[PDB]
């Protein structure tokens, strides 16, 4: 319910005393990029820092209080997460010779945004013990995000010509490196490092959180096709947009040459009739049930692995995440 | 001369206790980083040598063995950056994302080495944080160039009109110019204990000097003495976004544009290079070269003469090669 006012705070800090942002007209220029890319509603990820910090602190042990400045710093890390998300997504909406110019514009927008996170961390965490551990954490996620984004770029462009480019290892690598790292690992890891701990003793939680991010994106991908548009509020467009959906990949693995030509001849096309031809081929593969298998299997696998963690509070946080994502329609 | 024995010790500290896949990481390291040339590592040391031989605090002498070591450690960090920047240039339709996935993860392994190098060897210095800023800046500019070059090279397979001067200049600037010319000098400067944000004028010079160097490369790869270079120019065959192609596409506004579209086999490649000749291009190079050299010489002399001596040394080692 609390509205995270911190966004305007950080914008005022960066746009004033910092290192750049001198000319009034450059200050306005930077602000337009900032507000177009970062505070785009949703904000489920950055708060998950706060929910994680709140549950970790409520269940640890003595030293036990609650400061407003603590909430402030946790929310600042949450906004750093939203900045990372913004940089990861800069290249997602493409719509030939006009393409390098468009990419150059987008790249340089995201280039501007990547140079804000270090200033935020320095301004607000220079003096803390865990500052370097935080910078390590963000450099890891930053570089993994960048790797996934570069692979996604190769795939989406090579996906325009010949759909056979979409494969399960490529989809899983993009989903893991581009998305899963910043979305699920980084929030909890931020709450952990701010409590003054070392991530090198939580490698088991990382694999769980990373796989849950892949599960969350496979959840997303499935909903973008079979999810009651009246509940979502919008119609699934992934098939029109020629996206690298979990569904398309699993189809191309299990389909045959007659079904492959059906996918080659229809997928990507704007024609609605063809999108339905695709969705019917998805049903014809009985994919829905394969999804139910993947979901049930992943949930049991994660539940088992989670309950085996020592820190019971971490177990509570991951269980909270899993129970909030499970079989969701939103 | 300086036999840089030390890569063994750097690799040994990093490698060394890791399952038995240690060799796999080691093969990526020595396949990608040590190439022998190492012009991106020695220019670091030579630059520190000139910057150090200028600060006349008492009597100019020789750098301590530990000093040479740390300067060489940064130069090799530079070589790591260079290796990561170039991981994707030997790309070779589909099958591109699988190849790219291998390459990106190779560069990811090497990208996770530079922070460990700096921490092990610069944890205690004042300027350590300035190093992390500098390397993240150059790394991110490098990554930006790689993404634009990627989009551009793919859009270069489809329609030759895609290659344009702003895209070429941005690629040259972000992908190459930062680590090649700025980064060495900036490393030597940060070890001298200086704030890079007081040298923005030198940065503009070095970045343009890197773009100037790549236009030079493009020119030699086409109108050279292969006996002096030791290699035949393939850029026109390889369908690269050459300085020549963009300048051609600006001026070829008729049947000459179609002649170039129906090209890119040496039977055709010779028709291209002859069409390049038709546009007095050699003269445009000499004009661009003389103009940029005088402009850069002016901007440099317009600058701490120590910075000027280093930049002038770079330009005099590059000029008209």
Residue numbers in the entry:
A (entry chain A): 6 to 66, 69 to 102, 114 to 348
B (entry chain B): 5 to 20, 27 to 102, 114 to 285, 289 to 327, 329 to 346
Sentences reproduced from the published study:
Ultrahigh molecular weight cis-1,4-polyisoprene and trans-1,4-polyisoprene (TPI), which are the principal components of natural rubber and gutta-percha, respectively, are also isoprenoid metabolites that are assumed to be synthesized by specialized prenyltransferases. These prenyltransferases are divided into two major groups, the cis-1,4-prenyltransferases (CPTs) and trans-1,4-prenyltransferases (TPTs), based on the stereochemistry of the double bond formed during IPP condensation. To investigate the molecular properties of the EuTPT proteins, we determined the three-dimensional structures of EuTPT3 and EuFPS1 using X-ray crystallography.
All dimers observed in the two crystal forms were superimposable with a root-mean-square deviation (RMSD) range of 0.797–0.941 Å over 595–633 aligned Cα atoms. The superimposition parameters suggested that the dimeric architecture of EuTPS3 was highly conserved and unlikely to be caused by crystal packing. Thus, EuTPT3 had a larger central tunnel than EuFPS1. Our structural analysis identified a unique, TPT-type dimer conformation, in which the central tunnel connected the active site with the bottom of the molecule. Crystal structure of EuTPT3 showed that the residues Ile164-Ala165 contact with Ile164 and Ile125 of the neighboring subunit in the hydrophobic tunnel, suggesting that smaller side chains such as valine and glycine provide the wider path for the product that may contribute to the activity difference. Furthermore, EuTPT3 conserved a hydrophobic hollow in the bottom region of the dimer interface.
